[PDB]
Design a protein around this ligand. Structure first.
Ligand SMILES: CCCCCCCCCCCCCCCCCC(=O)OC[C@H](CO[C@@H]1O[C@H](CO[C@H]2O[C@H](CO)[C@H](O)[C@H](O)[C@H]2O)[C@H](O)[C@H](O)[C@H]1O)OC(=O)CCCCCCCCCCCCCCCCC
Ligand SMILES: CCCCCCCCCCCCCCCCCC(=O)OC[C@H](CO[C@@H]1O[C@H](CO[C@H]2O[C@H](CO)[C@H](O)[C@H](O)[C@H]2O)[C@H](O)[C@H](O)[C@H]1O)OC(=O)CCCCCCCCCCCCCCCCC
Ligand code: CLA
Ligand code: CLA
Ligand code: CLA
Ligand code: CLA
Ligand code: CLA
Ligand SMILES: CC(C)=CCC/C(C)=C/CC/C(C)=C/CC/C(C)=C/CC/C(C)=C/CC/C(C)=C/CC/C(C)=C/CC/C(C)=C/CC/C(C)=C/CC1=CC(=O)C(C)=C(C)C1=O
Ligand SMILES: CC1=C(/C=C/C(C)=C/C=C/C(C)=C/C=C/C=C(C)/C=C/C=C(C)/C=C/C2=C(C)CCCC2(C)C)C(C)(C)CCC1
Ligand SMILES: CC1=C(/C=C/C(C)=C/C=C/C(C)=C/C=C/C=C(C)/C=C/C=C(C)/C=C/C2=C(C)CCCC2(C)C)C(C)(C)CCC1
Ligand SMILES: CC1=C(/C=C/C(C)=C/C=C/C(C)=C/C=C/C=C(C)/C=C/C=C(C)/C=C/C2=C(C)CCCC2(C)C)C(C)(C)CCC1
Ligand SMILES: [Cl-]
Ligand SMILES: [Cl-]
Lengths: 21, 137, 242, 35, 96, 61, 33, 333, 447
């Protein structure tokens, strides 16, 4: 489960910080 | 219909003594039988020699009698032909030939009682389907 | 010394072993020893089938036929006992080996004659008083021809002898008096005549070789029709061993 | 697995599926950017 | 035009083990007969009578009485080609 | 040495999980390079050192 | 038989050579624009 | 140059039929397979497909009608071996063993593979986009599956699909007995592909015919309202979408013609691709789901489902296919 | 965004075609996934491996590859120590992290284009010199990798050899076959039955030898492509673009995938049956052997036993005369395996050797392979479709054969897709037909 969320976590953090999505 | 104590009661030796297996015990023999035996013995037939099946009736006319726990354990330790004349561990998995049949290495004395128990119990549940082949599928 | 990988796919699997021209010797028969044949090979080269003439009452002839089942014809690895009889003659009594092949030839017109070329249960004997096997030694005898098919064979409608239907089930209400020949199946068993004629002898190794001619009946479709008379000619190679 | 690594044998059951998730993440990402 | 195999079911062949025509697998139905004695009984066929089965060479005194306790389950009919040809006495094509 | 094998191994998984999340979040982040850049460099260095330590000590457990 | 085998081998070679040499004789240039 | 004139005609766009370099293989191979098929369908003698010297008649002149006739596959004795005419001692032996089958299927597979390439080729010469040949790959793959791929995995061209109506059904039935292809999700996707394609074909045709714009009277065909090469569209996509979006709900409809036509291509092609792949992977005996005796009661009695009824039928095909060919109790060939 | 490049989100990787830095990134990132799966899958297989069971009763496809290379196994294929499997997985897994780190860096952090960063790594697709040069480097890498197999076989423990005398074992390969008449004779055999094309390679000498040869062929061609530019006939016969080269490799990867399918289905040399389970032909031949041994023991004369059809029940001839196993297995008579070749004489199966020389280990092997035939259901029920549940088994051979035919077929579709598009992009109508210059409207009418 922890390995599963590591994926979407990157997309969440990169959307909270206004990243280069 | 349940897997009752009555169903799980099979002959022990050839002198009428019996043994009552638990549901857990029966489930062990079924798993061990699929691990070691089912490749040749699925459903109680014998793929590599259909003339000799695992039916209780056939095991009774075998020499030595194999229709109780003792002889099936003995058979899994030192198997013989249907008349008990030749020892056949060289071509049939057994504890004696566990060097050339590896799936028999890790089998305890308890594991042989379960497998034998499953061979005697299953025809009681499934009747003619045990050993009948694809007519009864 | 050829290997399987040298031979596979060439046809030589169907040839009998030959002896070179330098082998017109004589192999002696000691009446005080018991001999056998440890390998008997028969390679057919010509299948002749007797035509069925109209009503000329005349010479039925053996026409030539085209083989259609490829290089599958030869008998080999045949063994048996070779008896020294009282009057000096020898007798080969066939025992085991690849002693049969189903052959199918095609006549002019298209008709396919199936047959079971065989020497099953051959008993072949020589002329009296043969002190040695020479290049004029003849072996003659009879053999049994079993049915082309065995008991379990099922015709295309599902009929057979030890298995199958026993009627024309696609015609539930036809009168089956006319189809009794096709509904009841029979297992045939005829007799063959063969002559093995030695032409080369290696008196040192004990190998013999020559030509044979056998006469036997073809297939009868488990009794549905009349067999043809077949004649088979070829070469053989045997080996005597004490 | 050698017993000194037996502690991870639950983690091993999951590892081969990790490449598939990489396929799925590209959709999470394109979903997050509105395609 | 008769079916030889069907007609043979009309004789004792249909009730007992015919020592000249029955497949060797039927000797599994009785104790101590398969596969050692069964091989000998099929290899030494035919027999003019059921009692002639005890005169096979090389039988131990044990094996002789094993056949005697089973003479009652034996019979003898005429040799039939469609049941002994094709090697069918060792494998008639019927498994399970 | 076994204690060291267990903690170097336990550090490699943790560092790997951090690097797996951190490295892409930092690469796609804005100015967050003045930080991350040097921290990724030796995060890469210590990761390599940790792999080697675990591999060496593995033959002493 | 062997005469047929040689006859078909020649036929097959002929057409196969038409194919390779035809598709090497400047195919991309054969288009409308 | 003379070779350039030849190449200019091979590749011409002014030919009634396009030839092209793919066509330089296609035309002779198809002509060979077609001529030999016609002759063998009418005239071939019986063929010993199961290699047990029990020949199977398949031609008209030997007692077959259009429904029962086939070019019979080559012998099981041959297996996967190559068997042209010259490998046979005589035409008679070649016919007996199934020669015309190999001749036909190998020439045909070569010819149809080049048909596909011909489709790319003329499309390139015409200024077209190139993917029509990708769609035709779905039936071509299917043909490859049943004539070539399935024989490879099983080990004999004798298990190839007969070239005949009844022979085809004999193929489907024996296949289901051996592989349980109804319970295989790749054939199910094929069903979903051809049923769905039939449905969508029906749908698109009714929806466009429904939206045709009035251009004719009643005493003539609506078709004469379209003239070959008009620039105006002949139906009203907006009305058709207005209709069909109300039939279900608007977002379940297509308002983009290109998006709708792409869907028309993709649904049957993909599904047929998978069903080609299902034949091609059952060739290696990766079979459909097996649920036999899957449901059991507390005592251990089998509680049949419909899968166990499918098995009883599979069994009955099994013990009757090739009724004389088996000498041993497992069906491994 | 799609307005910038033309391609939509579902075709988004086509935006990478002329961005060499990001394209390098995805490629290096993808290679990490492969290496990741290889290591991860291995450890999974090892965590589930049981030494007392054969490998093929356990759903293993990687450990069999490692054991064929000679690591981990002893005589007859028995697993003696599992640590070499462990290493192969860990190292691949650890390496994938490296490949991942660089791949992601080049993808979202590095420079998008390389052409302004360095003149050596940068490339223009239409530049025929730079492309052949990159091709040359990679050809050199391929040659080295093929020689690493040689080196493992000749200098570093050898290879597992199912044909080794006394029963298969690890064996060092001292005399690779270099005779071009053998090595390239394989490349010229027929694909059809009894021949086999390259799939018929049945000895490690021929395997090791062929790799020495392509190992050398590759490095030479690599040097040749680094030093030359494409000739004029090649220039006008090809399409020079990124998609075009991608299509050329899809066709190749497709051809290779089909070939891989046939290899693991028919070949039991570089796919030892000890590890992969018997082949299809093998298990059927093993069935016929098992019943021959059983019936003969009962007293049957297996040479003269006639079967229902009239053919021999145990033994018949092939179309070229060879004594073969009878029954429906007649189709499988091209099978060759170490458990059966002792009974093979020059004319085929030797009736005398059948009668007197069958050894217990052969009867055991035939029975084992008969009851492990590569036949099973999608949910891994073992047997024909009509089999009742009991045996959990599908042969690795089935699993490997079926998957790679799927991958091969779809990559052939991939080739047709990108090939035609490459051709249309280069000619300038991959987006549709210009209304004001429709080609057909200027050709004459067919009639
Ligand atoms: C540019 C390309 C254009 C090509 C144009 C046409 C050129 C010729 C085409 C031939 C087509 C394939 C026919 C051969 C099929 C086959 O039986 O191939 C099988 C062979 C293997 O042959 C087998 O090889 C075996 C080798 O095993 C032997 O050796 C072994 C060694 O251990 C063992 O000992 C074993 O027991 C022993 O028998 C035996 O020889 C068998 O008898 C023999 O049949 O594999 C192989 O040749 C290798 C793989 C061949 C291709 C696989 C088929 C691809 C078809 C996909 C088409 C899809 C189209 C989709 C369109 C949309
Ligand atoms: C859209 C995607 C759909 C994905 C599927 C969703 C369900 C997956 C659940 C599943 O599968 O669950 C099944 C298994 C895990 O379950 C286990 O499945 C095992 C599978 O058997 C394997 O293991 C057995 C015992 O160890 C035997 O060794 C047997 O032979 C061997 O095949 C056993 O049955 C276990 O009892 C059971 O617990 O997942 C696995 O295997 C993992 C499989 C991952 C994909 C493998 C790719 C293979 C590609 C083949 C394609 C070729 C064409 C196929 C046609 C379609
Ligand atoms: C080596 C392989 C390879 C490579 C490098 C490329 C590269 C490319 N292809 Mg090509 N292609 C390939 C193989 C390859 N292709 C194959 C094998 C096929 C046939 C199937 C195609 C068919 C194809 C088409 C039809 C198109 C491309 C296009 C493209 C471009 C855009 C791709 C994209 O954005 O995908 C984005 C990826 C996706 C949207 C996800 C796809 C997921 C698939 C459909 C399902 C996978 C399921 C999995 C197996 C199991 C289920 C998992 C699930 C349960 C989680 C790009 C240049 C496009 C093009 O021409 O651009 C100009 C285009 O339209 N390719
Ligand atoms: C194997 C799969 C694969 C790979 C390697 C790539 C790679 C790439 N794609 Mg493609 N793509 C793929 C599948 C893939 N794609 C599929 C399946 C689809 C369909 C959904 C698309 C659709 C698509 C589109 C629509 C676009 C791309 C673009 C790109 C490029 C830029 C992506 C970007 O801006 O990310 C930004 C995203 C992030 C910064 C979020 C984080 C992403 C990273 C990679 C997570 C890594 C996690 C990992 C565990 C970390 C490891 C750490 C290490 C220490 C081990 C990049 C080279 C873009 C392009 O071409 O731009 C010019 C573009 O427009 N792709
Ligand atoms: C070529 C690849 C390949 C092969 C031959 C195998 C084979 C095997 N694997 Mg493995 N595996 C693979 C890839 C492969 N695997 C991959 C990529 C992963 C990562 C997810 C795994 C993860 C994995 C695990 C975790 C396990 C196995 C196991 C197994 C065994 C059981 C398989 C099974 O029951 O599948 C079930 C069958 C399916 C799920 C059917 C899938 C059908 C696919 C989706 C069709 C796709 C078609 C096409 C590509 C789609 C695109 C179409 C579009 C373009 C139009 C078997 C020995 C098991 C085992 O026994 O281990 C000991 C086990 O536990 N595998
Ligand atoms: C195919 C792989 C590949 C390619 C073509 C490139 C290409 C490039 N990288 Mg990248 N890179 C890669 C992989 C790759 N990288 C990987 C795997 C990583 C993670 C470790 C990185 C990490 C990385 C960084 C951190 C940077 C680059 C940068 C660069 C550029 C400068 C490289 C240079 O001058 O090297 C000169 C040559 C050397 C330093 C010697 C290399 C010796 C090698 C590694 C020996 C081993 C060879 C052997 C065959 C490898 C086997 C691998 C295995 C999987 C089979 C260049 C465009 C730089 C850049 O663009 O900055 C703006 C930069 O900063 N790369
Ligand atoms: C990955 C491998 C690879 C690749 C992609 C290339 C790519 C290229 N090479 Mg190079 N080359 C390679 C390896 C490779 N080469 C190696 C290893 C060598 C050393 C032996 C060479 C030796 C070489 C030479 C000598 C030449 C090239 C040239 C070329 C170019 C034209 C190729 C061509 O027309 O092929 C198309 C192939 C043909 C036209 C051959 C005719 C048709 C054959 C017979 C088809 C047979 C296929 C059939 C299915 C059978 C396959 C199985 C088996 C029986 C063979 C091209 C850029 C040419 C160039 O311009 O160089 C500057 C050139 O003259 N290469
Ligand atoms: C007795 C009492 C109580 C009476 C009271 C009744 C009452 C008032 C009820 C009100 C409340 C209420 C409505 C309750 C309903 C409950 C309910 C949900 C019932 C429904 C049950 C049910 C089974 C519904 C099924 C719904 C259904 C069929 C969904 C279909 C999904 C599906 C397959 C969609 C596919 C559509 C699709 C892919 C279309 C594209 C394919 C195609 C070729 C299109 C062709 C095409 C498309 C175009 O687009 C245009 C342009 C053109 C050219 C064209 O070719
Ligand atoms: C080796 C290892 C490691 C690593 C790991 C990794 C690398 C991971 C990754 C992971 C990942 C990479 C993950 C991912 C995930 C993802 C997901 C989970 C997703 C999902 C998705 C979905 C669900 C989707 C949905 C949707 C959308 C969104 C859109 C469309 C619609 C739909 C609905 C489809 C570590 C460090 C731990 C350590 C140990 C070992
Ligand atoms: C570009 C891009 C992409 C892609 C990406 C990728 C593909 C990446 C990769 C990545 C990778 C490829 C990664 C990898 C990683 C790995 C890791 C992280 C590992 C680690 C490991 C370890 C740490 C180990 C450990 C151990 C040991 C040592 C021993 C045994 C046990 C254990 C396991 C514990 C996507 C699609 C998303 C989209 C966006 C863009
Ligand atoms: C390792 C090994 C080996 C060997 C191998 C080898 C030696 C190989 C070689 C190979 C080769 C040597 C290959 C080649 C191939 C080729 C190809 C594949 C081709 C292609 C072609 C193409 C593709 C072309 C096309 C075209 C045409 C047709 C016309 C014009 C246009 C174009 C150009 C497009 C052996 C078996 C011994 C054993 C095992 C191991
Ligand atoms: Cl049938
Ligand atoms: Cl059979």
């Amino acid at each position: 489960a922890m390995i599963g969320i590591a994926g979407p976590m990157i997309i969440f953090l990169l959307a909270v910080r206004r990243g280069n999505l | 219909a349940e897997l009752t104590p009555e169903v799980l009661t099979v002959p022990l030796n050839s002198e009428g003594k019996t043994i009552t297996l638990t549901e857990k015990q029966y489930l062990e023999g079924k798993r061990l039988f699929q691990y070691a035996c089912a490749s040749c013995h699925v459903g109680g037939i014998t793929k590599t020699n259909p003339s000799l099946d695992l039916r209780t009736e056939t095991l009774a006319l075998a020499t030595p009698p194999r229709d109780n726990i003792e002889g099936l354990v003995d058979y899994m330790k030192n198997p013989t032909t249907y008349d008990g004349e030749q020892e056949i561990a060289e071509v049939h998995p057994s504890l004696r030939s566990a060097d050339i049949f590896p799936k028999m290495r890790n089998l305890t004395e308890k594991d042989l009682v379960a497998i034998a128990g499953h061979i005697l119990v299953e025809p009681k549940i499934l009747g003619d389907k045990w050993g009948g082949g694809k007519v009864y599928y | 010394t050829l290997t399987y990988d040298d031979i596979v796919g060439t046809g030589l699997a169907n040839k009998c072993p030959t002896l070179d021209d330098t082998a017109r010797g004589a192999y002696p028969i000691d009446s005080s020893q018991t001999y056998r044949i440890a390998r008997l090979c028969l390679q057919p080269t010509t299948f002749l089938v007797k035509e069925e003439p109209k009503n000329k009452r005349q010479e039925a002839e053996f026409v030539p036929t085209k083989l259609v089942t490829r290089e599958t014809t030869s008998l080999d690895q045949i063994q048996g006992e070779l008896k020294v009889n009282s009057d000096g003659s020898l007798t080969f009594v066939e025992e085991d080996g690849i002693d049969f092949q189903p052959v199918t030839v095609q006549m002019a017109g298209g008709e396919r004659i199936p047959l079971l070329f065989t020497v099953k249960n051959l008993v072949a004997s020589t002329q009296p008083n043969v002190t040695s096997i020479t290049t004029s030694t003849d072996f003659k005898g009879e053999f049994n021809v079993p049915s082309y098919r065995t008991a379990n064979f099922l015709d295309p409608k599902g009929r057979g002898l030890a298995s199958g239907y026993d009627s024309a089930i696609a015609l539930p209400q036809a009168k089956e008096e006319e189809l009794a020949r096709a509904n009841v199946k029979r297992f045939s068993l005829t007799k063959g005549q063969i002559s093995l004629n030695v032409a080369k002898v290696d008196g040192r190794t004990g190998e013999i070789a020559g030509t044979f001619e056998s006469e036997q009946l073809s297939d009868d479709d488990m009794g549905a029709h009349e067999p043809h008379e077949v004649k088979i000619q070829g070469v053989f190679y045997a080996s005597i061993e004490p | 697995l050698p017993e000194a690594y037996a502690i991870f044998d639950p983690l091993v059951d999951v590892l081969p599926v990790i490449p598939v998730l990489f396929l799925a993440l590209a959709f999470v990402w394109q979903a997050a950017v509105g395609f | 035009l008769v079916n030889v195999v069907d007609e043979k079911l009309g004789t004792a062949y249909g009730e007992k083990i015919d020592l000249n025509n029955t497949n060797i697998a039927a000797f599994i139905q009785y104790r101590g007969l398969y596969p050692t004695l069964a091989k000998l009984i099929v290899k030494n066929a035919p027999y003019e009578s059921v009692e002639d089965v005890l005169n096979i060479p090389g039988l131990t005194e044990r094996q002789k009485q094993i056949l005697r306790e089973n003479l009652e389950h034996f019979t003898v009919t005429e040799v039939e080609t469609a049941l002994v040809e094709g090697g069918d006495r060792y494998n008639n094509g019927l498994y399970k | 040495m076994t204690i060291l094998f267990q903690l170097a191994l336990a550090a490699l998984v943790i560092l790997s999980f951090v690097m797996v999340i951190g490295v892409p979040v930092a690469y796609a982040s804005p100015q967050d390079w003045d930080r991350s850049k040097q921290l990724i460099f030796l995060g890469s260095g210590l990761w390599i050192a940790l792999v080697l330590v675990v591999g060496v000590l593995n033959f002493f457990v | 038989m062997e005469t047929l085998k040689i006859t078909v081998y020649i036929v097959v070679t002929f057409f196969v050579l038409l194919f390779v040499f035809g598709f090497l004789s400047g195919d991309p240039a054969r288009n409308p624009k | 140059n003379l070779w350039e004139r030849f190449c200019n005609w091979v590749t011409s766009t002014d030919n009634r039929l396009y030839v092209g370099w793919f066509g330089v293989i296609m035309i002779p191979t198809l002509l060979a397979a077609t001529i030999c098929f016609v002759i063998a369908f009418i005239a071939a003698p019986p063929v010993d497909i199961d290699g047990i010297r029990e020949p199977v008649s398949g031609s008209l002149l030997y007692g077959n009608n259009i429904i029962t006739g086939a070019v019979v596959p080559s012998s099981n004795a041959i297996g996967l071996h190559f068997y042209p005419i010259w490998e046979a001692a005589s035409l008679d032996e070649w016919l007996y063993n199934g020669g015309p089958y190999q001749l036909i299927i190998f020439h045909f597979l070569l010819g149809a593979s080049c048909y596909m390439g011909r489709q790319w080729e003329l499309s390139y010469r015409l200024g077209m986009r190139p993917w029509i040949c990708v769609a035709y790959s779905a039936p071509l793959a299917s043909a490859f599956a049943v004539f070539l791929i399935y024989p490879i995995g099983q080990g004999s061209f004798s298990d190839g699909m007969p070239l005949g109506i009844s022979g085809t059904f004999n193929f489907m039935i024996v296949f289901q007995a051996e592989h349980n292809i109804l319970m295989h999700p790749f054939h199910q996707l094929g069903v979903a592909g051809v049923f769905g394609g039939a449905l969508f074909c029906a749908m698109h045709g009714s929806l466009v015919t429904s939206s045709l714009i009035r251009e004719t009277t009643e005493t003539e065909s609506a078709n004469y309202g379209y003239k070959f090469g008009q620039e105006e569209e002949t139906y009203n996509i907006v009305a058709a979408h207005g209709y069909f979006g109300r039939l279900i709900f608007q977002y379940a409809s297509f308002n983009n013609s290109r998006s709708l036509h792409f869907f028309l291509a993709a649904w049957p092609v993909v599904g047929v691709w998978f069903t080609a792949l299902g034949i091609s992977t059952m060739a290696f005996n990766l079979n459909g789901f097996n649920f036999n005796h899957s449901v059991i009661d507390a005592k251990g009695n089998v509680i049949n489902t419909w899968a166990d009824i499918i098995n009883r039928a599979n069994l009955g095909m099994e013990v009757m296919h090739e009724r004389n060919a088996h000498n041993f109790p497992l069906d491994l060939a | 965004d799609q307005e910038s490049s033309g391609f939509a989100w579902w075709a988004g990787n086509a935006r990478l075609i002329n961005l060499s830095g990001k394209l390098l990134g995805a490629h290096v990132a993808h290679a990490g996934l492969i290496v990741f799966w290889a290591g991860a899958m291995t450890l999974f297989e090892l965590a589930h491996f049981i030494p007392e069971k054969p490998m093929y009763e356990q759903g293993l496809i990687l450990i069999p590859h490692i054991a064929t290379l000679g690591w981990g196994v002893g005589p007859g294929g028995e697993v003696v120590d599992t640590f070499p499997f462990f290493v192969v997985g860990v190292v691949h897994l650890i390496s994938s992290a490296v490949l991942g780190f660089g791949g992601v860096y080049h993808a979202i952090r590095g420079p998008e284009t390389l052409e302004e960063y360095s003149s050596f790594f940068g490339y223009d697709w239409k530049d025929k010199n730079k492309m052949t040069t990159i091709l040359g480097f990679h050809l050199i890498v391929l040659g080295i990798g093929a020689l690493l197999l040689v080196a493992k076989a000749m200098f570093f423990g050898g290879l597992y050899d199912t044909w080794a005398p006394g029963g298969g074992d690890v064996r060092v390969i001292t005399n690779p076959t270099l005779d071009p008449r053998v090595i390239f004779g394989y490349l010229l055999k027929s694909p059809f039955g009894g021949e086999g094309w390259i799939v018929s390679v049945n000895n490690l000498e021929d395997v090791v030898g062929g790799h020495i040869w392509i190992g050398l062929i590759c490095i030479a061609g690599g040097i040749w492509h680094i030093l030359t530019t494409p000739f004029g006939w090649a220039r006008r016969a090809f399409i020079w673009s990124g998609e075009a080269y991608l299509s050329y490799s899809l066709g190749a990867l497709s051809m290779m995938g089909f070939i891989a399918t046939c290899f693991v289905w028919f070949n039991n040399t570089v796919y030892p049956s000890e590890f992969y389970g018997p082949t299809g032909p093998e298990a059927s031949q093993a069935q016929a052997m098992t019943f021959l041994i059983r019936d003969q023991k009962l007293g049957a004369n297996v040479g003269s036993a006639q079967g229902p059809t009239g053919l021999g029940k145990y033994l018949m001839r092939s179309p070229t005369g060879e004594i073969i196993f009878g029954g429906e297995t007649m189709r499988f008579w091209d099978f060759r395996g170490p458990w059966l070749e002792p009974l093979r004489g020059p004319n085929g199966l030797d009736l005398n050797k059948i009668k007197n020389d069958i050894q217990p280990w052969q009867e055991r092997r035939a029975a084992e392979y008969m009851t492990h035939a590569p036949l099973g259901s999608l949910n891994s029920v073992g047997g024909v479709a009509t089999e009742i549940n009991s045996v959990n088994f599908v042969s690795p051979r089935s699993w490997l054969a079926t998957s790679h035919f799927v991958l091969a077929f779809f990559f052939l579709v991939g080739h047709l897709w990108h090939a035609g598009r490459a051709r249309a992009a280069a000619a300038g109508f991959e987006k549709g037909i210009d209304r004001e210059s429709e080609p057909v409207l200027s050709m004459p009418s067919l009639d």
